[PDB]
Amino acid sequence: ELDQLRQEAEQLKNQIRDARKACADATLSQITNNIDPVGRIQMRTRRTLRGHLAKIYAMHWGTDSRLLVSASQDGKLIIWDSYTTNKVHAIPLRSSWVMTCAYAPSGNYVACGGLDNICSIYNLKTREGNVRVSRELAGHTGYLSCCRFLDDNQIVTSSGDTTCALWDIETGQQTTTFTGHTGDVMSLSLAPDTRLFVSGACDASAKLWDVREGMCRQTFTGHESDINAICFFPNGNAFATGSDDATCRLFDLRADQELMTYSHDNIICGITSVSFSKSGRLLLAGYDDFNCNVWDALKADRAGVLAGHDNRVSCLGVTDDGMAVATGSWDSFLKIWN
Amino acid sequence: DQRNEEKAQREANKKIEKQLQKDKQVYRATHRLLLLGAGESGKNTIVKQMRILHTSGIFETKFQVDKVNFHMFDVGAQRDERRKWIQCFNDVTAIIFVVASSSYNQTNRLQAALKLFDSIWNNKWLRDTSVILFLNKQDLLAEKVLAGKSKIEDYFPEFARYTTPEDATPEPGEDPRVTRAKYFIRDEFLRISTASGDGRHYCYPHFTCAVDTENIRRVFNDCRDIIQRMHLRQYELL
């Protein structure tokens, strides 16, 4: 009987809630009460990269922390050189509605996906030099919202069909499919060791996935609206979720429970992108209302604002060595903050 | 040396900039149109109408009217939850909405279309995007209302007191009842659109049929009006 199963699910959820409550020995604010504040932080735009026609939906720093690839709704992948501002590549896409992009850890490939369910892999190191499509992954049945390379051969993608997918570029097939979410998945962040990866899926729930064995490990709740921004903590034992309820929240894998929320009364617009600094003390969070507040990830007190954008922020990412912060926006301008 | 590599990088940047300048003159000169509606709306017949004259997640149909190029985007594989992929179409020229009139009596297809149009109208990202509205279902409305099968008044109690407006003009030989129902259907969308639309975006109701040929001409005229109004607005003339 369906009614019997609902009662069992409710009982198990109550057991989970009771177990999490028992572990609530003390709050992060209480533990981190005596630490010194990070103080006010001023970040000036050290670089402004322009050349996109339509709104920018995604970007990704390179592993060298020098190059970055940007995707805009005008159908162009433009690879920038953040140091000299000079464009190195400009890839004309087959679909104008690209809403994600990625940079391979080796730097050989870049990928993009959009409203067309196909995910395209681009080879930057061709013999002739010109960028050509190496593989088109066409197994999804919905708009593709995020994609992250694991290596030069395996890419994990999250689509709007409520499923995350693990791919094999050489063969093009689906190695493993994750089917735990109920809403559209629109964010994911691989673990530092690439063993696991989380994903927020537009239903106020982030799930911890095992890439190898291939099923959800933990489910974290506490948001009141959609989730559209996620990022692992540099340590790898926490992550921060950006949501449409204008709050940022920090979760923990080991404690399996929320430990801190970053919200302010003056902000009533949802978060659109989150990132951490190298030390993990600051949690940057791109916002609607054209700001990107910088949050003290320990004391929850805001430290500074990266104001300077004239439209909605869409993407945000700190370099691997943590030297600079770049943002994107619907006005088609990227800005390097430091 | 470092200087040689730097100069090569500047040369590559100049080549890319020259190509992007050429590509800019096409993106700016082409109008992007989003075709919307439900399955019963007959939007597929409209797509065929554009195609004859000239499993993927999105379909692109390109047609030109008087040497002006238009780009029509039709969604084919996305799910029914539109609140997340509809934000991508906040910079299109004009959303084309096709209502499935007289496809009921979903319990109420027209009410669902009205709610969808209201949600589009009040969206804070689609608040500057105009919504052309083609009532593709009228010929069938006449047949379904003359025989009484459509039976509109039970669904909408406003049909018991609505009076045909002065500006209304029936087609030659059109029955008063079908004309009254047709103008009521439009007036509902007008009532939704005449609020929260002060000077940002506009709606262009149109009564049409699936077999109509001049749909491209009406889309062209409404896009022209949209462009002219935007240009007058940026000069603060209007």
């Epitope: 009141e224 609206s225 449409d244 309820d245 | 799910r79 939850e81 609140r83 669902a112 709610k115 949600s119």
Partner: nanobody
């Protein structure tokens, strides 16, 4: 977790009355717009009514205008629906839907098949 639980449904003769009450927890009730959604057997999901944040703006579907009445209690974090003069065609599963975003008056996706912030629903048969 966004939890919506409705109650008050049951069996009633035509021409009677029946009150549906929904209890909301896990989110600030006063910020979010609320709706009512019903699904007739053999049919799709049909929108019934809604109400703004403070209740100043109320709208109904055409077929139930004048017969139903929706009110919300932000202090008690609950939503009501007073149904009067019922009809046999009113037999449907009544779900309570919530606006996906807090402060937006657009209410996308509430009647979709797989909405994530919609209640389980209560059978109401006339």
């Amino acid at each position: 977790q966004v939890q919506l639980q409705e109650s008050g449904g049951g069996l009633v003769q035509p021409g009677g009355s029946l009150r549906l009450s929904c209890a909301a927890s896990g989110f600030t009730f006063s910020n979010y717009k609320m709706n009512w959604v019903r699904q007739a057997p053999g049919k799709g999901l049909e929108w019934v009514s809604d109400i703004s944040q403070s209740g100043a703006s109320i709208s109904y579907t055409g077929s139930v205008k004048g017969r139903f009445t929706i009110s919300r209690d932000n202090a008690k974090n609950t939503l009501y629906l007073q149904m009067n003069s019922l009809k046999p065609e009113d037999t449907a599963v009544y779900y309570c839907a919530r606006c996906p975003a807090p402060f937006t008056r657009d209410c996308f996706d509430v009647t979709s098949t797989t909405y994530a912030y919609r209640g389980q629903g209560t059978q109401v048969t006339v």
